[PDB]
Amino acid sequence: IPLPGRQSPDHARAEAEQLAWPRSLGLIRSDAAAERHLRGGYADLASRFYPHATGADLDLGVDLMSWFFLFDDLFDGPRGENPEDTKQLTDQVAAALDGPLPDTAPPIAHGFADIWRRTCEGMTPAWCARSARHWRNYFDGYVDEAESRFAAQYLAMRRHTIGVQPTVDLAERAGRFEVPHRVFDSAVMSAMLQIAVDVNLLLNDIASLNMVMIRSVSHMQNEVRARLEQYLLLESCLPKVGEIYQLDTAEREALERYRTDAVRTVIRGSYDWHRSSGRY
Numbered sequence: 001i002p003l004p005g006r007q008s009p010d011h012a013r014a015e016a017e018q019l020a021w022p023r024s025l026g027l028i029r030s031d032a033a034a035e036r037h038l039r040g041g042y043a044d045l046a047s048r049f050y051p052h053a054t055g056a057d058l059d060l061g062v063d064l065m066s067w068f069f070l071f072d073d074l075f076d077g078p079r080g081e082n083p084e085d086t087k088q089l090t091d092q093v094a095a096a097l098d099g100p101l102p103d104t105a106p107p108i109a110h111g112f113a114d115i116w117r118r119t120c121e122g123m124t125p126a127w128c129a130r131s132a133r134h135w136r137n138y139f140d141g142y143v144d145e146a147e148s149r150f151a152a153q154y155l156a157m158r159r160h161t162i163g164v165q166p167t168v169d170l171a172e173r174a175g176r177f178e179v180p181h182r183v184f185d186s187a188v189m190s191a192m193l194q195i196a197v198d199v200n201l202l203l204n205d206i207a208s209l210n211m212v213m214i215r216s217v218s219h220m221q222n223e224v225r226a227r228l229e230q231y232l233l234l235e236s237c238l239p240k241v242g243e244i245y246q247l248d249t250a251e252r253e254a255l256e257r258y259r260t261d262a263v264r265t266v267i268r269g270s271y272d273w274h275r276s277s278g279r280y
C-alpha cells in the first residue's frame, strides 16, 4: 500500500471519551460490554479513517465506527440467518433516513438517527440525498445476505455490506468539504471507489480467516496489489478528469481533498488498523 499512514492528532482525547456517546444512547449497558467495546480499537480506526478531523468532527467519526460494530453484532446469531427478522430491524433503522423515529424504536436505531442528524447538518441537500442512498444500499445488503444464508456473486453483495462508502461519505462531512458531485459520479472516481471497497473486503476476509473459502490467500494478495497499482494509475487521470468537467479552483481543491482525506484514508487506515485490532 504505497499510501502514507496518518492518524488524527486528536486521537487520544477521542479514544478516551469514546464510551460516553453509546452509553447515553443505550447501546452499551454493562461495564463488560464497555470493555469489549474498548478492545475493538474503534476510535483508533476512526482517527485513521479521518486523520483530518479533530474535536466534534472526529467524535462523529468515532461514533460511526462504534455504531457500525454494535449494529453488525445484532446479526451474528439467529437473526442473521432469517431475512424476515433481519429486514424488520434494518427497516426500523433506515426509517431514520426519512424522518423522526418513534420513541419505541430500538436503541440501535436511535443511535443511527443521532449520527445521521449530525452527518447532514451543514451539507448540501444533494449530498445528503446521495449519502442516504448509500445507507439504503448498505441496509438492503444485510437483507440480501440473510436471504443467502437461509466470487462475482459474493462481491455484488459484499461490496454493499462492507460499509466502505458510508465511511468515505463521513470523511467529507468530517472534513467539511464535498467532492464535486459530477466528479463523484464520474467513471474514474467510481472505479477508484470500487477499488477502495474491494481492497477493504479482501483485507478483512484475510484478517477474519469469506472470499478465501469461496493458493487462495496468495491470489487475494495479488489482487490487492493489482488493484492498488490500478488505483495509482486512476489517480494520475484526475487532472484530466477535472478539465473534462471544467472544475474551477475551489472544485479542484475539493477533489484533491477527497482523494487524499477520503479515498486514500479508507484504503490505508483499514490496513493499519487490521494489523493491531482486538477483534482479530
Ligand SMILES: C/C(=C\CC/C(C)=C/COP(=O)(O)OP(=O)(O)O)CCC=C(CF)CF
Residues within 6 Å of the ligand: 068, 069, 070, 072, 161, 162, 163, 164, 167, 200, 204, 208, 270, 279
Ligand atoms: C470499512 C469499515 C471497517 C473496516 C473493515 C471491517 C472491520 C469490516 C468488518 O468485517 P466483518 O466480517 O463484518 O466483521 P469482523 O470485523 O471481521 O469480525 C467500517 C464498516 C464496518 C462494518 C462492520 F462492523 C460494516 F458493518
Ligand SMILES: [Mg+2]
Residues within 6 Å of the ligand: 072, 073, 076
Ligand atoms: Mg460480526
Ligand SMILES: [Mg+2]
Residues within 6 Å of the ligand: 204, 205, 208
Ligand atoms: Mg470478515
